[PDB]
Amino acid sequence: APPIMGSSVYITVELAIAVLAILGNVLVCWAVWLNSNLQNVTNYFVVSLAAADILVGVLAIPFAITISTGFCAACHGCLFIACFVLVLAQSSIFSLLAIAIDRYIAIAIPLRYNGLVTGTRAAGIIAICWVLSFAIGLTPMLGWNNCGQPKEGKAHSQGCGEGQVACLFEDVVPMNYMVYFNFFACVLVPLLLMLGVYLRIFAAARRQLADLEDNWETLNDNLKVIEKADNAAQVKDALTKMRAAALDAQKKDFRHGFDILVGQIDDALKLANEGKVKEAQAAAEQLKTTRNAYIQKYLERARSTLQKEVHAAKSAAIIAGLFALCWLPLHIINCFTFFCPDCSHAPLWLMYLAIVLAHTNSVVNPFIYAYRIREFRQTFRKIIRS
Ligand SMILES: CC(C)CCC[C@@H](C)[C@H]1CC[C@H]2[C@@H]3CC=C4C[C@@H](O)CC[C@]4(C)[C@H]3CC[C@]12C
Ligand SMILES: CC(C)CCC[C@@H](C)[C@H]1CC[C@H]2[C@@H]3CC=C4C[C@@H](O)CC[C@]4(C)[C@H]3CC[C@]12C
Ligand SMILES: CC(C)CCC[C@@H](C)[C@H]1CC[C@H]2[C@@H]3CC=C4C[C@@H](O)CC[C@]4(C)[C@H]3CC[C@]12C
Ligand SMILES: CCCCCCCC/C=C/CCCCCCCC(=O)O
Ligand SMILES: CCCCCCCC/C=C/CCCCCCCC(=O)O
Ligand SMILES: CCCCCCCC/C=C\CCCCCCCC(=O)O
Ligand SMILES: CCCCCCCC/C=C\CCCCCCCC(=O)O
Ligand SMILES: CCCCCCCC/C=C\CCCCCCCC(=O)O
Ligand SMILES: Cn1c(=O)c2[nH]cnc2n(C)c1=O
Ligand code: NA
């Protein structure tokens, strides 16, 4: 069958993906630019990721269309056409890893997050990661390429000129680079690091939530202990455990509530130390008023903040997982090409499918933000309506 027919389907699909990648990710950038509620360090990496995806549509997809034709080119110019998409994928990986680390810092040390993770430092990190992405993705242009061993028969058959090759991805980019350096070292290892970070994020959230509930139960259990105590020493034991737990939960209406709680524990402790059991128990009963009016409100707000962090971490993890799902088939095919020379090469239609799937990753993030983050979804609606 004429190659232009199957080429037409592949090219049409690539162009459709390019349009959608541009439109959706331009919308992401317009949303962060316009909405100050979206202007935080996490979303600066989101914007960097959306910029990489815009460039997939503007440059990498036109380059992929071009390299599918095998047109005659100087080999090093062919290399750039071949490898620029690896720059964008590498930049995406750095942004994804940054987002993961950012959410870990926010959940593990929220008291020093704002002083540690700043906008100026983030912009510097983004710049360094773009430079590193060019270095990693264009490493074949530094000499790790097949330009020294051109396919002269293929070039002659296509009428290429002297010093030119048929510009095809697997003819110029070495597969050992693609498998060992790009895939294993530069893609698989960072994705596994992201997995580790997300595992630590969710474990940290679950621990802080058993801790919030454990302190709440300890407060209520020790109150019952005081009510049914029969001597001052038992009242004293329970209050001492309550006092240490109250300060542990303390680490304007928030501070006042815990100021009342500790002060009321101290009142009952002094009565308990005087052997006045009934008076200490009555003073300890006043703690329930503070618990209902203040402490329970702090417990439901701390729980609410943690659940929103879990939700935001899951949204980011879905983005990272979709990157892996969209890119792994192409990398896995390269592994079969490289590691199994006795295996027939993956057919051309499957190569095209795996390439298109990798590009489709540049469409999906705007949808995840719209469905999972209300501030983005609402800002998307205002932009579209207006
Ligand atoms: C800032 C942006 C818009 C600039 C985009 C420039 C792109 C399209 C340019 C930069 C380098 C160029 C390549 C440089 C060298 C060669 C080798 C030549 O034998 C065929 C064309 C080819 C393969 C060029 C294709 C076009 C190219 C990829
Ligand atoms: C990462 C998740 C989505 C799994 C993706 C698995 C895909 C990429 C796997 C599953 C089965 C695989 C194929 C199984 C057998 C062959 C025949 C061989 O001569 C060339 C490679 C080829 C054609 C493989 C290419 C990659 C392949 C299609
Ligand atoms: C965490 C996971 C997803 C990492 C990705 C798994 C990759 C590295 C694994 C999955 C299946 C594997 C392939 C399965 C079958 C073969 C055929 C054999 O003749 C050579 C190795 C080769 C080609 C393997 C190479 C590595 C491979 C592609
Ligand atoms: C914002 C605009 C920034 C402009 C930076 C330009 C960077 C792109 C340059 C690419 C040069 C690579 C082409 C060299 C191939 C020559 C072929 C050969 O030597 O065999
Ligand atoms: C999620 C399901 C995906 C839906 C469509 C995917 C179709 C592509 C799947 C291919 C599996 C293996 C194809 C093997 C092709 C023949 C290999 C060969 O002869 O060399
Ligand atoms: C600003 C949007 C970016 C520009 C998109 C341009 C769309 C054209 C798509 C692909 C370019 C294909 C170049 C043709 C390959 C040469 C064919 C040959 O010489 O054999
Ligand atoms: C060819 C490049 C290979 C080596 C990569 C070097 C790493 C990137 C170098 C310079 C990045 C410049 C921006 C640095 C500003 C830092 C701001 C900050 O972190 O607060
Ligand atoms: C594959 C290429 C290897 C890259 C070489 C490694 C060198 C670059 C690495 C990190 C750059 C660190 C940023 C330091 C710049 C100043 C920061 C500051 O002022 O605080
Ligand atoms: C990233 N990448 C690949 O890994 C690959 N393998 C075979 N063709 C390929 N193409 C066109 C590609 O862009
Ligand atoms: Na990407």
State which of 66, 67, 157, 160 you would mutate to test the pocket of ligand 6, scoring each by most atoms of that ligand within 8 A of its C-beta.
Answer: 66
Distance 170 CA to ligand 6 centre (A): 20
Angle at 197 between CA 192 and CA 199, to 5 degrees: 95
Report CA-CA distances (Å) from 57 to 54, 94, 145, 199: 5, 19, 25, 32
**How far apart (Å, rounded) are the C-alpha atoms in residues 300 and 215?**
13
Query: Max Cα separation, the chain?
Result: 105
Name the token pair of 269: 């402790």
Q: Is 85 in the pocket of ligand 1 (CB under 6 A)?
A: no
The set of protein residues with a Cβ atom below 6 angstroms from ligand 9 is 64, 67, 85, 169-170, 178, 330, 334, 351, 355
Specify the amino acid at residue 9. V
Instruction: Show the domains of the chain with their CATH numbers.
Output: 3-202+311-385 (1.20.1070.10), 211-299 (1.20.120.10)
**How far apart (Å, rounded) are the C-alpha atoms in residues 140 and 82?**
10
Please tell me the number of the ligand nearest to residue 131's CA: 7
User: How many residues are present in the chain?
Assistant: 386
**How far apart (Å, rounded) are the C-alpha atoms in residues 337 and 345?**
6
| Contact partners, residue 373, CB within 8 Å, separation at least 6 | 312, 315
Report CA-CA distances (Å) from 156 to 149, 161, 288: 14, 8, 90
Distance 290 CA to ligand 4 centre (A): 70
Burial of 210 (0-12, 13-18, 19+ CB in 10 A): exposed
For residue 217, the 8-state DSSP code is: H
Residue among 87, 57, 127, 66 at smallest CA distance from 361? 57
DSSP, collapsed to helix, strand or coil, labels residue 191 as helix
Distance 219 CA to ligand 8 centre (A): 50
For residue 185, the 8-state DSSP code is: I
State which of 81, 85, 145, 164 you would mutate to test the pocket of ligand 1, scoring each by most atoms of that ligand within 8 A of its C-beta.
Answer: 81
Which atom belonging to ligand 4 lies closest to the Cα atom of 147?
A: 20
